[PDB]
Design a protein around this ligand. Structure first.
Ligand SMILES: Cc1nn(C)c2cc(C(=O)NCCc3cocn3)ccc12
Ligand SMILES: [Zn+2]
Length: 140
């Protein structure tokens, strides 16, 4: 589990969104496994605006924050899970590291701020949904 709180927005994995998130939906994209909902209170997170390929992510199944190198956001084939059939997931970044389904929502961060959240994994690779291209998260 996990979310990003920036301005009056809440960014979560689309497969873990709650009924309140869907009722207060701002934007969602199934191919990215992301959903953004509106909030009443202001968040404190800063979204990175950069092309970094190094950072640190939180892995709940190890209670550890791991420094990693990661790929640039791309369209990658992802095997079936309990939440989606096998399909191409867009805006996905991979790193060599440990992850389990319940690690979804763990934040990847660089020196500039939040880069993305854990979404996929397997074979010793962890996949993160990028949010750096969602420029509108910084305004209004
Ligand atoms: C080993 C592993 N690490 N991680 C973080 C996983 C995540 C899943 C998973 O169910 N994700 C749901 C969202 C989703 C995107 O694409 C398909 N399904 C499955 C296996 C792993
Ligand atoms: Zn950065």
């Amino acid at each position: 589990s996990g979310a990003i709180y920036v301005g009056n927005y809440r960014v979560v994995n689309r497969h873990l969104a709650t009924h309140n998130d869907w009722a207060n939906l701002v934007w969602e994209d199934s191919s990215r496994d992301l959903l953004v909902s509106s909030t009443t209170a202001q968040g404190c997170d800063t979204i990175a605006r950069c092309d970094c390929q190094t950072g640190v992510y939180y892995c709940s199944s190890r209670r550890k924050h791991y420094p990693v190198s990661f790929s640039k956001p791309s369209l990658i084939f992802v095997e079936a899970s309990e939440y989606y059939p096998a399909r191409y997931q867009s805006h996905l970044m991979l790193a060599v590291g440990h992850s389990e389904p319940g690690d979804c929502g763990g934040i990847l961060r660089c020196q500039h701020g939040v880069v993305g959240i854990v979404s996929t994994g397997g074979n010793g690779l962890v996949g993160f949904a990028d949010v750096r291209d969602l420029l509108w998260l910084d305004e209004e």
